[PDB]
Amino acid sequence: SLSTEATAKIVSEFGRDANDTGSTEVQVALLTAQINHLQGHFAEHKKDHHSRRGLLRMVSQRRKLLDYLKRKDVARYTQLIERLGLRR
Amino acid sequence: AVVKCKPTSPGRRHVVKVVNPELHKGKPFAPLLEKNSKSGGRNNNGRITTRHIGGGHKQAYRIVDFKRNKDGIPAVVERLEYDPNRSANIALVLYKDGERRYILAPKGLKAGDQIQSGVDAAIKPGNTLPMRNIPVGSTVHNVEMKPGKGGQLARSAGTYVQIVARDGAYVTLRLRSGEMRKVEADCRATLGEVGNAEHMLRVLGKAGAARWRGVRPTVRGTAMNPVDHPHGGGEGRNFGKHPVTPWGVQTKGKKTRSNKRTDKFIVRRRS
Amino acid sequence: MRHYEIVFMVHPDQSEQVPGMIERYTAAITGAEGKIHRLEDWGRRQLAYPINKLHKAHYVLMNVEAPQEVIDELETTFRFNDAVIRSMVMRTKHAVTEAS
Amino acid sequence: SMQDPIADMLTRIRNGQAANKAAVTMPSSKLKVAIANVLKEEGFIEDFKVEGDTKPELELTLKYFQGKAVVESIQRVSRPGLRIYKRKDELPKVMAGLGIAVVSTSKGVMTDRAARQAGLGGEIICYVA
Amino acid sequence: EIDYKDIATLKNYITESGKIVPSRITGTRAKYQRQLARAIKRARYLSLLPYTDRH
RNA sequence: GUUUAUUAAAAACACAGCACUGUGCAAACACGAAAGUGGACGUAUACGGUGUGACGCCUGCCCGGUGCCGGAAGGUUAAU
RNA sequence: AAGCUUGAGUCUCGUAGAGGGGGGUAGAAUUCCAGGUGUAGCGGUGAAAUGCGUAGAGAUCUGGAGGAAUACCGGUGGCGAAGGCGGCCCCCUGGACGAAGACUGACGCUCAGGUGCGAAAGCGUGGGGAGCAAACAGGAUUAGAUACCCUGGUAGUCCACGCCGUAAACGAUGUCGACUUGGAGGUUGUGCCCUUGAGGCGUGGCUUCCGGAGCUAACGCGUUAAGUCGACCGCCUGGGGA
Numbered sequence: 001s002l003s004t005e006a007t008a009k010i011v012s013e014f015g016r017d018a019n020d021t022g023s024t025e026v027q028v029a030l031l032t033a034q035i036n037h038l039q040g041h042f043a044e045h046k047k048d049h050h051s052r053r054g055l056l057r058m059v060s061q062r063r064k065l066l067d068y069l070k071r072k073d074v075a076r077y078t079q080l081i082e083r084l085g086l087r088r
Numbered sequence: 089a090v091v092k093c094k095p096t097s098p099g100r101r102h103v104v105k106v107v108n109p110e111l112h113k114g115k116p117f118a119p120l121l122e123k124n125s126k127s128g129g130r131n132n133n134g135r136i137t138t139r140h141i142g143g144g145h146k147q148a149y150r151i152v153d154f155k156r157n158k159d160g161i162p163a164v165v166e167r168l169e170y171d172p173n174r175s176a177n178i179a180l181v182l183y184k185d186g187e188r189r190y191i192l193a194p195k196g197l198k199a200g201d202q203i204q205s206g207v208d209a210a211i212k213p214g215n216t217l218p219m220r221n222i223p224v225g226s227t228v229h230n231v232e233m234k235p236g237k238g239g240q241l242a243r244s245a246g247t248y249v250q251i252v253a254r255d256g257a258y259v260t261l262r263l264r265s266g267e268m269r270k271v272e273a274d275c276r277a278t279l280g281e282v283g284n285a286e287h288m289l290r291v292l293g294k295a296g297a298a299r300w301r302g303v304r305p306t307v308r309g310t311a312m313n314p315v316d317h318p319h320g321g322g323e324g325r326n327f328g329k330h331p332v333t334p335w336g337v338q339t340k341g342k343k344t345r346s347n348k349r350t351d352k353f354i355v356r357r358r359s
Numbered sequence: 360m361r362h363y364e365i366v367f368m369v370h371p372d373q374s375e376q377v378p379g380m381i382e383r384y385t386a387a388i389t390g391a392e393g394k395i396h397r398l399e400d401w402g403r404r405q406l407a408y409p410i411n412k413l414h415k416a417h418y419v420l421m422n423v424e425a426p427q428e429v430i431d432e433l434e435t436t437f438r439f440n441d442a443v444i445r446s447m448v449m450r451t452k453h454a455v456t457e458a459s
Numbered sequence: 460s461m462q463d464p465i466a467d468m469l470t471r472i473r474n475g476q477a478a479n480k481a482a483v484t485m486p487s488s489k490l491k492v493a494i495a496n497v498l499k500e501e502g503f504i505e506d507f508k509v510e511g512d513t514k515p516e517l518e519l520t521l522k523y524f525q526g527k528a529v530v531e532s533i534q535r536v537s538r539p540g541l542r543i544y545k546r547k548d549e550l551p552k553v554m555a556g557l558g559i560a561v562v563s564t565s566k567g568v569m570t571d572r573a574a575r576q577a578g579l580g581g582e583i584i585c586y587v588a
Numbered sequence: 589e590i591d592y593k594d595i596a597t598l599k600n601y602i603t604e605s606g607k608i609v610p611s612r613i614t615g616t617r618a619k620y621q622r623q624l625a626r627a628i629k630r631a632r633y634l635s636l637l638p639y640t641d642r643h
Numbered sequence: 644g645u646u647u648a649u650u651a652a653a654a655a656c657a658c659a660g661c662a663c664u665g666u667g668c669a670a671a672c673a674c675g676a677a678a679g680u681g682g683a684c685g686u687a688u689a690c691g692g693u694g695u696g697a698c699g700c701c702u703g704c705c706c707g708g709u710g711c712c713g714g715a716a717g718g719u720u721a722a723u
Numbered sequence: 724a725a726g727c728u729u730g731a732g733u734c735u736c737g738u739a740g741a742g743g744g745g746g747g748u749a750g751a752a753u754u755c756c757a758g759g760u761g762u763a764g765c766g767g768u769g770a771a772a773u774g775c776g777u778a779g780a781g782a783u784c785u786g787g788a789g790g791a792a793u794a795c796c797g798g799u800g801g802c803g804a805a806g807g808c809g810g811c812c813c814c815c816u817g818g819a820c821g822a823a824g825a826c827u828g829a830c831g832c833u834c835a836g837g838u839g840c841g842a843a844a845g846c847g848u849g850g851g852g853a854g855c856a857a858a859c860a861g862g863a864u865u866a867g868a869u870a871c872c873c874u875g876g877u878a879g880u881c882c883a884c885g886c887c888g889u890a891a892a893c894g895a896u897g898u899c900g901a902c903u904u905g906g907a908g909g910u911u912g913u914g915c916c917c918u919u920g921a922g923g924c925g926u927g928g929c930u931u932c933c934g935g936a937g938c939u940a941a942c943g944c945g946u947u948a949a950g951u952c953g954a955c956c957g958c959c960u961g962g963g964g965a
Contacts, residue, residue, distance in 0.1 A: 001816070004735070022826030027733065041816075048744045049840060053804075054817035056839085061732085061830095068830045102659055102697065124684075133675035138682060139691090149684070175688060211439070223441040241667080245688045253787075260788095264850095265687045267667055268788095288688040289848085293697085295644070295658035305645085305657050309693070319693090324655095330710055331664090331693050335673080339692050340664050341711040344671055356756085356788090358667080358687095368635075407595075407631075408638040410749095416635070430813065431746085447634065448813070460832050460900040461730075466953040467901050474902070474951060477936085486901095513729050540954080608795060618798075625796030626811095632749075633811040639750045 002034055014083070024069045025080055031062040032084045090289050102293030106286045110197045112167040116150055117180065120190050124149035126302070139334075144302020147172050152190045154230065154238035156205055156216055156276070158183060165199040165214070175245035175287040192230055192243060193283045205276075213280045219259050220273035224251045231261065232276040233269070239276070246285025260355055268356035309334065360393060361427040364449035369417035371403055373442045377419075380443050387433060388423045396422035396454040416445070422454035463539055464488045469585070473533050476521060487515040493568040494585060495519055497561060501570065503530055503587055532558055532588030546580040558588030592627035595636055602628070606641025 007030065011021050014029040021027075038055045066086075070077040081087070093103040124147070129138035150173060163183045171178040174192075179199070181189045194213035203214035208221065219228060228249045230239040241263065242249050250262045254273065262268045292298060310327050314320030318336045319327065333339050369377050381398075388395060401418035408414075425433075430448070437446045461467075468485060475483040485491060487509050495507045495517065507519040522529035532554060537543040545551065550571045551560050560571040564581035574581060591597060601609050601624055608628070611621040631637035 007734090019826050022733070022828085024827070024830075027827080027830095030733075038816080045744055045815080048816070050743050050803075051815090051817045052839080057817085065732095065830065071830085072828095099659075099697070122684090127681060127683085129673095129681065131674055132680050133677080135674055137672090137674045137680075139673090141681095151684085174685070223439060237669090241686070243686055243689085247686085247688065255786095263667075263687075265667065267687090269667075282688090285688070290688095291659070293659055295697095297659080299658095307656080311656075327694080333672085333692055338710065342665075343712080344665055344691095345667095347667090347670085349669095350667080354667080406635050410635075427814085434747095434813065445635070450813070460954085462832075462900090462954050467951095470952055471902065474937095478903080511729090515729095535952095538953080618796095622796050622798095628795075629811060642751095 002030075002037065006033070024065050024072070025076065028062060028065050028069065028080060029084060031058050031065065034058050035062060036085075090286055093293070099293060102291055103297075104289065104291040104293070106284070106290060108197065108284075110168075111177070112169050112199075114167065114169065116148070117188055117190070120151040120188075122149050122151065128302075140304045140306055141302055142304040143299065145300050149173055150178055150190055152178055152192060154192070154240075156239070158187070159205050161185075162202045162204050163189075164202050167199055168193060168197055174243060175284060176243060176247070176282045177245075177284055192239075194229075194278070195281045195283045197283060211279075214278060216276055216278045218274045219251060219271075219277050222251070222279075224254050224259065226251055227279065227281050228261065229278040229280050229282070231271070233261075233271045239278075242282055245282065245287035247282045262356075266358035267354060269353050270355050271353070360424045362451050362454055363421075363423050363425055363430070364447075364452075364454070365421040365423055366447050366449060367417075367419045367437065367443050368445035369419060370442045370444065371413065371415040371417055374417045376442050377417075380437075380440065381419075384421075384436060387429070387436065388421070388425055391426050391429050393423045393425035393429075396424065396456045397458060398422075399457075399459050401459065422456075424454055465490065465535070465584075466538075468494075469533055469535055472519075472521075476528055476530070476533070479523075480521065481523070482518050482520050484516055484518040487511070487517040490568070490584070491517055494561060497568055497570065498587075501559065530587060532586065534586035535584075536560070536586045537583040543583040544581065545583060547575065547578055550575050550580060551583075551586075553586050554588040558586065561585040561587075589623050589626075592630055593634065593636055595631065598627060598631060598637065 010029050010033055011018075011026060014026045015021070021030075035055060035058045038051060038058065041051065041055075066077070066081070069080065089107050089109075090104055091107050093100050095101040126144065127138075127141075129136045129141040131137050150171060152174075161184055163181045166180045166182050166188075168177060168179045177193045179191050179193050181191050181203075183189070191214070196213060201212065201214070203212070203216075204210065205216040207218060209215040209217040219231070222228075228251045230242050231249060232238060233240045241247075241261075248264065251259060252262050252268070253260045257273055258270055259273045259275075260268060260270050309317035309319035311321055317334055318332050319329075330338060331340055385395065385398070398421055399419070401420070403415055403417050406414050406416060434446075434448060437443045464486070468491060471483050471485055492507075492509060495504065498504045498519075499507060503522070505520040505522055507517060509515055509517045545562070550562075553560050553571075561584050562569060562571060562574050562581045563584050564574055564577075564579060566577065566579075568584070569577075601614065603609060608621075608624065611618060611624075614620070616624075628637060632639050
């Protein structure tokens, strides 16, 4: 549950020539935008294992797509994880 | 919150105290402070009046208001501090022209909100109005049940009063004692609950922890000398006769209410 | 902005107070940049069976086209007033303009 | 899910022949069209045809002559997890010489005959009669 | 699903015994009895219909 | 930690915590032949009475007798 | 390493659902509370009896308190990871699914030990107590009754939460993919014919019963296969003892 109007602030910055939205650099950003939204969501409230598993599904796909991007090009990986919060 | 001590030395592991990271501190407001003096059960007219009292470290009394007489003036909460006289903690209030008062703490542990009183006042904590205003089934806080005694009931940590029913000029209130009472609907109430509510969770852990509060050790009537209590020293582990007061009279299960003047206001009695 | 009809059950013997409540409820819609479509009465009507000893209610409805974020701070304003009672907000389903 | 393009190749043929079907169709691959070319040369099938712009699909025709199925054994032997490799005199005599085997080799897909004639061995891919 | 706030219509589908008229009797499809039960529940929680019967 | 000065020092006593009982507050309760004060400028997360003994795991039956409560319809019944 | 996509993924306009969480929000009787009207009955079993009742019961009314669950529709049905979950009304939200297209470019399948879930019952701190009821005390019944059956009844059931982690957790069938006779039926999208559309011709998702080739000792599984075949994981070699 993320609008076409909220994606319009992600595909604008993480794109390059349009349409780029199928690419790993943009899908890792669209997953991060859903993860960081469904992180809170929680607090207030906790007791919902369904949306908690949804969050962990989106994280599971992001972990893999990050590892995959790093396995294609390390420079395109490092130039993404300065624009999205990772490893503090 | 409540927190438990580490085993640094013997028995200390049992110690549990109430702690609040937002609770303020400072100096008491002198025009609402008195030293109040120790009473010690030792008697101005003769022999002792009370038992299990001796010593205890210096304390003073902070004067709290239950009259709420300054109507139609907004007042602001300035700070909430630890109180030595009631477990609810007590807040400092500043009125719009310069007057400062101590009040029973509303819930939220916070300062900076402004409060009023009248016949109609805002739904927020610390604002006061008559119980005839509200649809019942809620918490009323400290209640002016008798005008000539101020705001009564629910003064200790986490204490509450439920308003159950209404008709015409009257309403009914139910208490955590087991008693239920009837009052005029025009009686003033502040609505909501008292804060803290953790005071009953405290564990002293140490045999000196009530000594610094003046609490003297309890010696058994069946252990002290036979003339000094009606039970009397053993005759080891054989209590003998029915339990009595130090004054020689039976007490267990025997009801002692003799008031007769307020029973017509009590609609359900404490068991 | 999101549709809500907001229909009140005003007390059948206390409707003499109601303009002061209305002027405080409309304020919460105008402040929020909403759009009032009717703010009109159906008048005094009968109920289906007697509740809280009453068998009548006085009906008034707003149609507000309001921001969705206001609902949980609006449905509480006619919940403890005891002269404007038993309100239904009736979400979505558009709005009729200016009619009874 | 799907790991081996050959693990759904010969089942179609063994099950379609049991259903008495004259043609059997599969998704196409380099090894599938390499096996089909040798199975036509050795006469185990009549013909094969391959077509598709979206996905290329391969259809081969089964022999029944006048009613009775002409291929009397259709087996795989070897799998990618546990492969079978035979040396120049360890090459098999399928159905005690009534059938044949197919091998991949360094010279490309051929019969156990063509491999033994080439004085070489290799990896097994099919067993037939 | 439609016109469920009209009680002059709804009272043709509920009994003096304080119950519901069967879909066998109205000649209606099974999901009309669901539409009717939803109309009854949506009239109850709107002060249009009573929740219970008896004198 | 407490335990009697110069033969009776600890397992006895207290203590953290456990239960029952009286108390709606001008409390109940106590001392005061009282004036008054203590209870407490505490208010049921608060006080009076009696036993248990930190901590972890724990609590069968009996209301005839002697006390106490609920009922006051019936009995017994005094000064009057 | 270089190159791809028709493996896998996300999406424009859109679809149903007792899924979850937070809020609420509504009604009934055994009960309790203060009484009327009123006379010897009430209660209960296969039989009876303790017991409730003349202190005015049972029942019938007036005015009121208390606790739990959500009647109807409800099924041929949905959802959820399982366990489980039906109200209306207002938010917060996971996953799945259709139409007509597109952007990436093997990013897939599985998984020791982990990392997180709970039905009933149980443990903790504070509340709660209509109905049902372990335990218990009676009525009995009987050779005996410590039990069935009848009269009463605490724990437990509910809530703030915190713990517990187990089940006949069961269509007793590990997860994942392809290929392939059906019928009858339910449920939800949807392509098309002026839908001039009630009608007709199609087509994806989910799924119930009957059953065929195959499998199986047998019963069953049966295109949602226990079939046909492959990847990985978890297990295992007789009861009595244990």
